[PDB]
Amino acid sequence: QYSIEKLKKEENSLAKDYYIYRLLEKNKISKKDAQDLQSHIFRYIGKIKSELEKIIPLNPKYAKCYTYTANTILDANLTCQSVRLNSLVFIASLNSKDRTTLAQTFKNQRPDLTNLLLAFNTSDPMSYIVQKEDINGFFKLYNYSKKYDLDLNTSLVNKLPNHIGFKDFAQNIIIKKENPKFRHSMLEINPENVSEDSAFYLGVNALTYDKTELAYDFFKKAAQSFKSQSNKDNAIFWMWLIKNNEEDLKTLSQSSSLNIYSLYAKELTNTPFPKIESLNPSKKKNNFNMQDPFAWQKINKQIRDANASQLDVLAKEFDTQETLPIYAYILERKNNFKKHYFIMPYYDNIKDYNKTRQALILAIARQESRFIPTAISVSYALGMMQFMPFLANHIGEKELKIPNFDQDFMFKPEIAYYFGNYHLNYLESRLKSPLFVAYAYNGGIGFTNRMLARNDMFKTGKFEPFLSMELVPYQESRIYGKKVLANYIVYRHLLNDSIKISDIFENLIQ
Numbered sequence: 098q099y100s101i102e103k104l105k106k107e108e109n110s111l112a113k114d115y116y117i118y119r120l121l122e123k124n125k126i127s128k129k130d131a132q133d134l135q136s137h138i139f140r141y142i143g144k145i146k147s148e149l150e151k152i153i154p155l156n157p158k159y160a161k162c163y164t165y166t167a168n169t170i171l172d173a174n175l176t177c178q179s180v181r182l183n184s185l186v187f188i189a190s191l192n193s194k195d196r197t198t199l200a201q202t203f204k205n206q207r208p209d210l211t212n213l214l215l216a217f218n219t220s221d222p223m224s225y226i227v228q229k230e231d232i233n234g235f236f237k238l239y240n241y242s243k244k245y246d247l248d249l250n251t252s253l254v255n256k257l258p259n260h261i262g263f264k265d266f267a268q269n270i271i272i273k274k275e276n277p278k279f280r281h282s283m284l285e286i287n288p289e290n291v292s293e294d295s296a297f298y299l300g301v302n303a304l305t306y307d308k309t310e311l312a313y314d315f316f317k318k319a320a321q322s323f324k325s326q327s328n329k330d331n332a333i334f335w336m337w338l339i340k341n342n343e344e345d346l347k348t349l350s351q352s353s354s355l356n357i358y359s360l361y362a363k364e365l366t367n368t369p370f371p372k373i374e375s376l377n378p379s380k381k382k383n384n385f386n387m388q389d390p391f392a393w394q395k396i397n398k399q400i401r402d403a404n405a406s407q408l409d410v411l412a413k414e415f416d417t418q419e420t421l422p423i424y425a426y427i428l429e430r431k432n433n434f435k436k437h438y439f440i441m442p443y444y445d446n447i448k449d450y451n452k453t454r455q456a457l458i459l460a461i462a463r464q465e466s467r468f469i470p471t472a473i474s475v476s477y478a479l480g481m482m483q484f485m486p487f488l489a490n491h492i493g494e495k496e497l498k499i500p501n502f503d504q505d506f507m508f509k510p511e512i513a514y515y516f517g518n519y520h521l522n523y524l525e526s527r528l529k530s531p532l533f534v535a536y537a538y539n540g541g542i543g544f545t546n547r548m549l550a551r552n553d554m555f556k557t558g559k560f561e562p563f564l565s566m567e568l569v570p571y572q573e574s575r576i577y578g579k580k581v582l583a584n585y586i587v588y589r590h591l592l593n594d595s596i597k598i599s600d601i602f603e604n605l606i607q
Contacts, residue, residue: 101120101126101130104116104117104137105137109137110139110391110394110395111139111473111475111477112390112393112394113137113139114139114145114477115390115473117134117138121145121148121152122144122148131149132153135149135153144476161177162177162180162181163181167191167192170199171199178199179203179207188217189217189241191214193217193218196215196217196218197214197218200214200215209233209234212226212229212231212234213234221247222238223235223247224247226238227247227253230252230253232256233260235260239262246278247278247279248281248282249283250282250285251285254282254285254286255290257286258286259290263291264295264298267283267295267299267302268294268298271301272571272572274553274568274570280305280306281306284303284306284308288317291315293323294319294328296315296318296332297315297319297332300316300319301564301567301568304564305568309339310339312339313339313340316333316336317332317336319332320336326352326354327356330352333348334349334361335563346362349362350365350366353435355371355437356579356580357582357586357598360583360598361599364597364598364599365599371437372437373437374439376424376438376440378416378417378424380418381418382417383415383417383419385417385419385420385423387419387422387423388470388471388508388509390473390508393423393470393471396411400426400427400430403430405431408431409431411427412427412431415427421442421468422440422442422466422467422468422470422481423469425467426467429467437587439587440468441459441588443511443514447514450518452592452593452594453589454521455588456589457531457585458482458514458517458521459588460535460581460584460585460588461482461521461584462482463584464581465481465482466480469481470508470513479504479505479507480508480509480510480512481510481513481514482513484513488520489516490504492520493516497519521534521538524538524542528542528545528549530601530604530605531581531582531585531601532582532601532605535585536569536577536578539573539574540577544571554568555605555607556606557606561606562606565605566578566579586598586601
């Protein structure tokens with residue numbers, strides 16, 4: 098470990114945060130050591146904040162305004178009332194006499210506040226706001242209570258997409274399968290009124306009610322408006338699944354984006370496999386330390402700051418086997434993510450696993466870390482396979498009994514791949530398909546089991562398994578699974594062990 102004073106020398110980074118956090122969680126930082134530690138934390142969110150505030154606890158314009166309570170709010174001036182009435186919890190806490198008075202007071206200057214004040218006099222504030230078609234109020238109330246749910250007319254639902262909250266509202270209720278009356282109402286949104294992710298989710302919604310022509314119209318709108326080729330491909334795939342137009346399949350097979358949809362279309366049209374870059378430096382190693390987390394943070398900052406000529410210079414400093422992940426990382430930026438980099442670094446460590454397992458390990462590592470051995474996430478997951486300290490210590494200390502085990506052993510590629518394999522043996526025994534294994538690797542076996550036990554997920558159906566892949570209940574896991582699955586297909590191909598993509602999808606249907 099590093100002493101608190103040595104850490105304070107280091108530049109501020111997620112690595113420095115992580116080591117500060119290691120000392121805090123062991124109670125190794127004294128009260129004076131802890132004093133200026135606020136300024137030595139790169140990202141002062143989550144576990145590290147909570148832990149520092151056990152030692153060091155934390156706008157004068159409005160200090161006066163928080164002296165007032167529900168009982169004294171009418172004594173406050175207009176500015177203080179305004180500030181306090183930003184909270185719906187606070188509005189709900191008032192009595193109806195005072196809400197009625199405040200409603201009259203704010204009628205001209207804050208009419209949206211008036212609507213909410215009056216809404217909270219009724220037993221269903223959402224019904225009141227819906228009657229008004231007060232869109233700002235609608236989203237405030239949804240954020241206040243996710244339980245409100247009622248039928249919304251065509252006029253109202255077609256106004257909802259003109260609010261920045263709509264996208265995540267729509268996504269959340271669709272993938273969580275909540276607010277049935279809201280979901281059903283959104284069938285009357287005109288595709289003309291939505292674009293990108295909103296249009297896409299409304300497509301998925303329409304598919305869950307078996308409105309296939311409506312779904313096509315939403316997916317087509319998404320395909321025309323998405324800015325990223327990867328999302329375009331996902332929308333075009335749905336246009337093809339619904340109407341079977343050959344030109345959509347062909348456009349999809351010709352995509353510059355390497356993803357499961359474009360790969361699947363290439364298979365279906367006998368289009369060749371995409372070109373994968375082949376990187377194999379002659380030099381085995383240099384003086385750069387790939388196990389030093391601070392050195393990576395420093396060189397990452399320099400790479401992220403660099404122009405074309407500077408990236409070319411940096412590439413030549415890292416053209417070695419041992420530094421291949423940094424080299425590939427530099428080159429991925431130098432070609433603006435246009436070429437396809439699927440490296441297989443520290444391969445001697447996995448060569449004795451069978452090729453299917455190698456492909457899965459590589460697929461997960463590429464997604465988790467791009468193979469950077471000292472990768473540290475915002476939750477302090479570590480190394481190429483991004484093990485959380487809890488799991489790393491459980492495997493290293495309890496189950497495997499490794500002498501002198503520290504969780505920083507995760508920065509060693511030999512350990513990362515070994516623990517990766519170990520954890521994959523456990524997941525794959527229960528879950529079978531590499532897609533389901535990916536979901537559990539990212540989101541835990543618990544949520545993955547609860548999901549697969551549902552009678553509406555990954556069962557036989559017209560648009561399965563593709564519909565279920567859009568309804569994974571966590572946005573992060575949905576995306577993760579698709580990316581890892583694409584990576585898995587590519588690594589199977591690179592290992593002269595190609596898999597038929599159609600086979601993979603057929604196996605998802607339980």
